[PDB]
């Protein structure tokens, strides 16, 4: 039941395609970046957005 | 000056507070000795922190535990929660930190939640039943 929805997924792809050489492969320093490069209303959502961003980058540097 | 650590232990409503200072070796619960914690079939539950790591470690410290809240079984699980945390936190501050891991290893390998209080909490009642999940009997005709 861990399926991210099209709010988290679509936002994370838009946040990679214009901030690629600022995001690491680490979650703890990615969610600190999402407070600066994005406006997200709730703390629970930006942890989900930054987590899927970190998951996408692990499969970007693979291929 | 009188090296002392205070800590707390919890079970379900109960909160034991331990006062671990350096001294002669009295282990008193609510002003009464540890040998008198009396559901008397869970008397050994306050005794595992005194026997897992060995009784020698308590010869130089003083323990004073006070409990409130909970029930008779829940409180017994709260002193042992506070005794275990009260000795590993004494060792973090006033003796070698290498010794703290050796006692933390002993309690965790025998984890009856001696160091980490369990996150099981009551579920609220709802309407249409006498319990959280239980429902009233329906009659159908």
């Amino acid at each position: 039941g861990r399926v991210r929805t099209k709010t988290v997924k679509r936002a994370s792809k838009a946040l990679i395609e214009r901030y690629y050489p600022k995001l690491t492969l680490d979650f703890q320093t990615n969610k600190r970046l999402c407070d600066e490069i994005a406006t997200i209303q709730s703390k629970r959502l930006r942890n989900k957005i930054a987590g899927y961003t970190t998951h996408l980058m692990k499969r970007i540097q693979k291929g | 000056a009188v090296p002392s650590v205070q800590t707390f232990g919890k079970k379900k409503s109960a909160t034991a507070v331990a006062h671990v200072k350096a001294g002669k070796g009295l282990i008193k619960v609510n002003g009464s000795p540890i040998t008198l914690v009396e559901p008397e079939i869970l008397r050994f539950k306050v005794y595992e922190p005194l026997l897992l790591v060995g009784l020698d470690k308590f010869s130089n410290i003083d323990i004073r535990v006070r409990v409130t809240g909970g029930g008779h079984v829940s409180q017994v699980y709260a002193i042992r929660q506070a005794i275990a945390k009260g000795l590993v936190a004494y060792h973090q501050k006033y003796v070698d930190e290498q010794s703290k891991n050796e006692l933390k290893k002993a309690f965790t390998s025998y984890d009856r939640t001696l160091l980490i209080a369990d996150s099981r909490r009551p579920e609220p009642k709802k309407f249409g039943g006498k319990g959280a999940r239980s429902r009233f009997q329906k009659s159908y005709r």
Binding site: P21, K22, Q28, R32, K58, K62 | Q92, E97, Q98
Partner: protein, 313 residues
């Protein structure tokens, strides 16, 4: 340059290592697990060192730590927007430093323990006293101040102290605390500057970051000297105190660079059992020992690895 074992006892990434000139076998490491651990080195192949005191009391990741010259006092820079001054004996905190609006990434102290500098993610740099008073706010970066260092001045104790402050804004800036003004600006880094350091004599500036390159500078000369390439994202950076070497913590391993002449000393890749190639643990902190024979490297394995130099034949 061979290893004689590891150090266990941290539960997170060992973010920063720091050693003291006073005690040569006192290592202080701060990690992701909100604690600092002071060790006692024994020089044994099975257990090179043991922990002796844990410094807990930070509410979030502790990014940087530093010792004093005599090793009695320790500073911790943490993500809880505070800095703490610790006694290495009896593990207590004397002073708490507050006033950053965001995470604190680095802390350094001068040799005389008079001023304390601290970079942060609020794009500002604050200079602190020993009693917790913030002297001034050295603003002027455009992004997170990723790391700061104080430059050791030259001999005979001339009253001129300079600090160097890298950042994600792709400028390295040299500051002048005699007037609390910017002294020099360094331009040419093409990515985030993760780490920077200075020579023991206080002339060289080495800085590196995401691109896979290290740029050497000369603060005395105010010219860039040249750049190297490491092909890997650079995490930490450390000058050898007497061997005239530059150690770099990369995504693949520890690369040690000699500059006279220009060649690679070694590429340290420890043996990891049970992981894949992508999930390769890497060093995120470097610290040469005070005597200059030993380098330490904290990893994302949550384990400190120890390398000490040895001549081949």
């Amino acid at each position: 340059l061979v290893l004689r074992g590891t150090l266990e006892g941290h539960n997170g990434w060992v973010t920063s290592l720091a050693t003291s000139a006073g005690q040569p076998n006192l290592l202080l490491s701060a990690s992701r697990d909100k604690t600092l651990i002071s060790w006692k080195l024994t020089g044994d192949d099975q257990k090179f060192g043991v922990p002796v005191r844990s410094f807990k009391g930070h509410s979030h990741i502790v990014q940087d730590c530093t010792l004093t010259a005599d090793g009695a006092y320790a500073l911790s820079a943490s993500w809880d927007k505070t800095l703490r001054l610790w006694d290495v004996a009896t593990g207590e905190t004397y002073q708490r430093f507050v006033g950053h609006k965001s995470d604190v990434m680095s802390v350094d102290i001068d040799k005389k323990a008079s001023m304390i500098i601290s970079g942060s993610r609020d794009k500002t740099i604050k200079v602190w006293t020993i009693k917790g008073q913030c002297l001034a706010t050295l603003l002027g970066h455009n992004d997170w101040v990723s790391q700061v260092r104080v430059v050791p001045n030259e001999a005979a104790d001339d009253d001129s102290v300079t600090i160097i402050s890298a950042g994600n804004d792709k400028m390295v800036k040299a500051w002048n605390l005699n007037q609390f003004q910017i002294e020099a600006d360094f331009i040419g880094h093409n990515s985030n500057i993760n780490t920077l350091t200075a020579s023991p004599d206080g002339t060289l500036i080495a800085s590196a970051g995401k691109d896979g390159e290290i740029m050497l500078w000369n603060l005395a000369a105010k010219k860039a000297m040249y750049t190297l390439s490491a092909q890997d994202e650079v995490f930490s950076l450390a000058f050898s105190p007497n061997r005239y070497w530059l150690a770099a913590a990369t995504a693949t391993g520890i690369k040690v660079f000699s500059l006279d002449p220009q060649y690679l000393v070694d590429d340290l890749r420890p043996e990891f059992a049970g992981y894949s190639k992508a999930a390769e643990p890497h060093a995120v902190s470097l610290a040469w020992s005070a005597d200059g024979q030993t380098l330490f490297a904290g990893y994302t394995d949550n384990v400190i690895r120890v390398w000490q130099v040895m001549t081949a034949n």
